[PDB]
Amino acid sequence: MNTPKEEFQDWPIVRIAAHLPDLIVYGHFSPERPFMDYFDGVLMFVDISGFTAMTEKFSSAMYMDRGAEQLVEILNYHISAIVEKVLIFGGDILKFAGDALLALWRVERKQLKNIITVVIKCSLEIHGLFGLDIRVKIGLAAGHISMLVFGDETHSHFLVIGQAVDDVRLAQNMAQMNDVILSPNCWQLCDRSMIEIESVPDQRAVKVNFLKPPPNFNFDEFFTKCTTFMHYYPSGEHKNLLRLACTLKPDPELEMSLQKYVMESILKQIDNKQLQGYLSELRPVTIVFVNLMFEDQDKAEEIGPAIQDAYMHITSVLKIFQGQINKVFMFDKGCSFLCVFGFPGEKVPDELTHALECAMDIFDFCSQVHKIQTVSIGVASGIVFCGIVGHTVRHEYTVIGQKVNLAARMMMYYPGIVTCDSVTYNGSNLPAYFFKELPKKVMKGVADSGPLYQYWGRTEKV
Amino acid sequence: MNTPKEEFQDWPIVRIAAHLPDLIVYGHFSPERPFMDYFDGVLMFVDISGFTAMTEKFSSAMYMDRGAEQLVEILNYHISAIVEKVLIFGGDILKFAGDALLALWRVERKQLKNIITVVIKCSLEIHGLFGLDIRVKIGLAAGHISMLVFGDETHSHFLVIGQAVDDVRLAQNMAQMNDVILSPNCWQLCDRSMIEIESVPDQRAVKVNFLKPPPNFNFDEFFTKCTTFMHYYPSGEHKNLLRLACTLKPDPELEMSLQKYVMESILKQIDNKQLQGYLSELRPVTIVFVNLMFEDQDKAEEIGPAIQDAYMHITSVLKIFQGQINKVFMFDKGCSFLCVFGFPGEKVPDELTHALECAMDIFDFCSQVHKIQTVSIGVASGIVFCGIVGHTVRHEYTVIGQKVNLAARMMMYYPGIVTCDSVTYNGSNLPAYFFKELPKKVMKGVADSGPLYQYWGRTEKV
Amino acid sequence: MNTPKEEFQDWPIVRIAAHLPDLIVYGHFSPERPFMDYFDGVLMFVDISGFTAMTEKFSSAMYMDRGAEQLVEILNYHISAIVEKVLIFGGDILKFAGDALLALWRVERKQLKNIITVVIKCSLEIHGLFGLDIRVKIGLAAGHISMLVFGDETHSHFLVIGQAVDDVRLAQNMAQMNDVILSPNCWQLCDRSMIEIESVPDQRAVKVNFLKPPPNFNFDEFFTKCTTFMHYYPSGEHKNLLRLACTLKPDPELEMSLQKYVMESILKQIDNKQLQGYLSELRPVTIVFVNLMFEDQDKAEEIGPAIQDAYMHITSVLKIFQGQINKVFMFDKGCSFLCVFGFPGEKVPDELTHALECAMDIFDFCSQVHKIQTVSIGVASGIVFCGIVGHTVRHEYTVIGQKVNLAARMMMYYPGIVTCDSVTYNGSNLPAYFFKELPKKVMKGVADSGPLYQYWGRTEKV
Ligand SMILES: Nc1ncnc2c1ncn2[C@@H]1O[C@@H]2COP(=O)(O)O[C@H]2[C@H]1O
Ligand SMILES: Nc1ncnc2c1ncn2[C@@H]1O[C@@H]2COP(=O)(O)O[C@H]2[C@H]1O
Ligand SMILES: Nc1ncnc2c1ncn2[C@@H]1O[C@@H]2COP(=O)(O)O[C@H]2[C@H]1O
Ligand SMILES: Nc1ncnc2c1ncn2[C@@H]1O[C@@H]2COP(=O)(O)O[C@H]2[C@H]1O
Ligand SMILES: Nc1ncnc2c1ncn2[C@@H]1O[C@@H]2COP(=O)(O)O[C@H]2[C@H]1O
Ligand SMILES: Nc1ncnc2c1ncn2[C@@H]1O[C@@H]2COP(=O)(O)O[C@H]2[C@H]1O
Ligand SMILES: [Cl-]
Ligand SMILES: [Cl-]
Ligand SMILES: [Cl-]
């Protein structure tokens, strides 16, 4: 009796799970919303500097209208290799955001010290990897982490919250190119007999200099010991897989739950109802970057209800005005929503007008939500890259472009109001007196925005 | 000199052959029609109970308009595993019909006894396999089998005929859930020193209790002995393949012959002229289930000409009224044609009217065909699953739904006339006096049909 | 720490490189145009006789409108196996032209003798391979070879030039079916102690009879010695690959350079923006076969500027009149351009008129280009096969059909004028007095053209 070749089976549930971390795929938690979970771990925030400039250049004539295709190919070639290292070292990629990603090693408290060594080794190998134009910056943090799941009956989003989350982003902001920076708490928890550092001026964070193994040390045996604490590390018969999620089997309940995290247009491609090519594009869109600030951004039980409340309104008005949520995460002393007008399928004219009217609506509503202290919204329009970024086994739909960064910086440098760039202003059908021309601020990571405006809106205020 | 990787070659001829059994792929018989062949073998009829209920539930809001995709994934995940067992145990899957299949082990007469043991072992392993909602029933028969191939210059169909065919379906109808039932002839031919059974009340068929190997018995060596008699069992260099048909090589003559069995829309997908997604759908259709009854349904040389004659008319009027033959097989003391109006591409309004006019046309014509004793036709309309069911190496286009079962039961409980359900009646553009409201019958496997009608047709009859 | 499965990565750059030889993929030469390179090597010109007849037959009713699909499948099944042999024996496939191909073994002069033995062995194995209707003819030549790259800022073409190029085609023209013929220079350079030949009447070329290895000879060890001189022979870890180009990694500069050789419609398929099925078709087109004759067709520095100059005009007027260059190569004492009107996407009516007006335009322009001695153009219209021919790792878009051959023969037998077949004449919207009916010539490889015409054009000439 034959024992024939079992082909890898690429069920729709496996393709869906590629868009999600193990934290969701294997979480089995309540469908109640908001839902909050608490744990400990190590976080790693990896940023490629320089793709957003490459993006601009891929629209030029030399790319012969295949700029989107060239960009996604070169981006994924690099990002894939980072994703593989994270996964082989036992991490869960939580999220991609443009040309950056956030990874987690969830463990019990007593295992933090050793897992931190694993994550540093991983980070140093990633620095190893990387025309001669892009750099990799890495921030690490460790400690208590909260997760929030929010959403409605057909859509789900999650994000992580707390000091370690705030620290991982601060650490990465300080990294100079090719640095690995540890948060103060990470440095306090780590194996100081192995990890040599250098102080960072005016900071308590530190920079990794090198690993100093002791005399008997064997990294592979140490790593094996740490894998005891890793619930989903592929092993035994599945030791040749990058993710245990590759072995998921059809299960309608689980798939119904997982699909709610993934955008319709991506589900259409998964279901072989649209060609893959269509979702990689360099197209004019409008970004609406919404920031919600709280008194205490580290306290999930406080902020969770508020984010849910805001989300319910946001999703409704985005649908009316033809926009979509691309990403949600903690940033800017708050929860930020990256919303997009003009994604695959969602084109119109008066897209600009809509973006602005939607932004004012969100601003008015969210400003009255209990515990939301300040709302800021940045609106910017231009050509942006949209497509699936990452590895075959772990990837997500994302946007990359100078206008994405501009909207986020506007939102940060002009708090408490709705602002817009020049393209949005000049293109909208709205009267000029609905706007106010603003003082120009020097803004970290933007060479020249053109004039910026406040969208003051309809009735006068003075 | 290198000896490089020979990639599996997925020629169009191999993809076509996935839709067909070895009985056709390797049959090389005459293109004359009708064509009849005679042989012996063991048949296995495997039924999953409960998908037709799941079908209804996959249209509900909780599936978020991906019901078709979820259904086909969960169905195929289960059916594939049954298909693999059949193929590894040396069987040829002849046909899928909804959530059921029919398999054959063709052998010389002297080998029936031992092959019956192989098929029982296979069936018991299949019971082994199988939310907690579906059951597997299995009927086995053995003896003389006839095959009929019929069709025209561009379309071919086959079916199997005779007592063993009738017996395999009777056996499976008696199976309670997870039973394997042997036909009287199967039980009479089998190795009684190994197969322990239990009587079935008011029947001569028997139920398998268990296998009782004797002291020296080794199933793998016995199986090896039986493979001597299996013409196409994958072996040697190809022992890692589930089917020898995976190795078919381009050959325009053979492909011209094989493609005539496969529907145009499936050929379009094979030829990468339409996305795979498009053929899995849950869509409103009209089923027209036609039964032709003969004096002796087991005598191919008698019934073959008649089926061919009926087929020629049926295919012509279906084309006029925009329907298609999905399946043909022996059932209901006769040859049944499962015809569908509304398949991928074939949508219209007045689809209901057409179905009914076509059914009356077929009824009038077939009733005059020599040797056709009675025609019955059931017409029912609702949401049904349409798509490719089975394993990658062996699969077919099929329909599944409560309206499919309803049309078949109508045809069986209301012989000699054309009947229709309420949806068809209320939706057609036909005057009410073309119909007669009928007494409601309690019908095995239908909880509530709503009112049923005879399509009496145009001129009065009284 | 796991060392998981590295999946083959099918980047867009690898798919592009499938359409190109190593000579371009690894050439890294100047973007200046014309560019000329000089080297030595052995050439092999392999022709399948009989596909062009099969082509006609695949349009007939018995193929049930899947003629294009059947043709490409049977063609590629055979061509692939020849491609594999060429690649395993260390050759670079330069170009496909219909059901023929041209391969090169580039080596230093001192290695020609031994490489010629490798190529003969390869050719003899290819004869080995091959309803019972097609024959393989092979011509071999060896010596100095020039390459010309020409084109504009977004399109590139290359071709090879010189005596060896002319000789390989002459050699193949003399081959009777299943012969391998050596050019005079090849026979003069080869290892005469191993290669036994037979004279060819009225020729200095010779026919291979057989290989006569000497007593100690081991072909595999000899082949290994010859691989020292092969720059891109897959080896070591990549010894299981048919081409080193399978390992190409994303690199935007290189991809920008390579894509310029490939047609837009093929790039669209590579980019998963169109289904594969669409490019295999049997469709009515118009072929415009343009021949440019020079005083000395073997002198690249002389003819290179002229081809570039002609190309710049040709590409411009083809774009105005909706045609495309399919292929360019040396043939007919000149450089020939195979141009097509009606390819995927480029349909119109007055396609015939356009073809003819474009041909006259090209004729008038090219006749004044310095060093172009005579222009001849053949225009023929009918059903032709269009699609991707070759192996997965090395394939190209090509056209096959009796009208392709007819246009080339017209161009050759009616030099110095623009001619057209009957279909083109009768279908064009042009007045009859713009044409002249011509004497019918017996034309090698055409049984009956129907009447042929000179397109005399608008103003009278007498
Ligand atoms: N695709 C994207 N998704 C999410 N955030 C983005 C994206 N592109 C840019 N950003 C944000 O732009 C910000 C610019 O300032 P920072 O670098 O502090 O933090 C950056 C990100 O949070
Ligand atoms: N693992 C370690 N344990 C103790 N001291 C350290 C370690 N790594 C670095 N240091 C010292 O900590 C210092 C902090 O300031 P400096 O970077 O000037 O130089 C650093 C080292 O001298
Ligand atoms: N897709 C299908 N193809 C063929 N027959 C079907 C399908 N769905 C239901 N049936 C028939 O419906 C019948 C209901 O009664 P039985 O179970 O006796 O036999 C069943 C089948 O023959
Ligand atoms: N292989 C076998 N050979 C002989 N007798 C059998 C076999 N299997 C079962 N039986 C007996 O046949 C009987 C028929 O009726 P029962 O099921 O009541 O119990 C059954 C067993 O006692
Ligand atoms: N697809 C094609 N591409 C290029 N040339 C072709 C094609 N089909 C036929 N030919 C030419 O047709 C010619 C007929 O005469 P020859 O055989 O001398 O040379 C042949 C080729 O050069
Ligand atoms: N490798 C070789 N070296 C020397 N002579 C040869 C070789 N191969 C063939 N010949 C002879 O060359 C001859 C040329 O004419 P013939 O073909 O009549 O017969 C041929 C052989 O007799
Ligand atoms: Cl997050
Ligand atoms: Cl059947
Ligand atoms: Cl060439």
Ligand SMILES: [Mg+2]
């Ligand atoms: Mg970045």
Ligand SMILES: [Mg+2]
């Ligand atoms: Mg069933």
Ligand SMILES: [Mg+2]
């Ligand atoms: Mg040819």
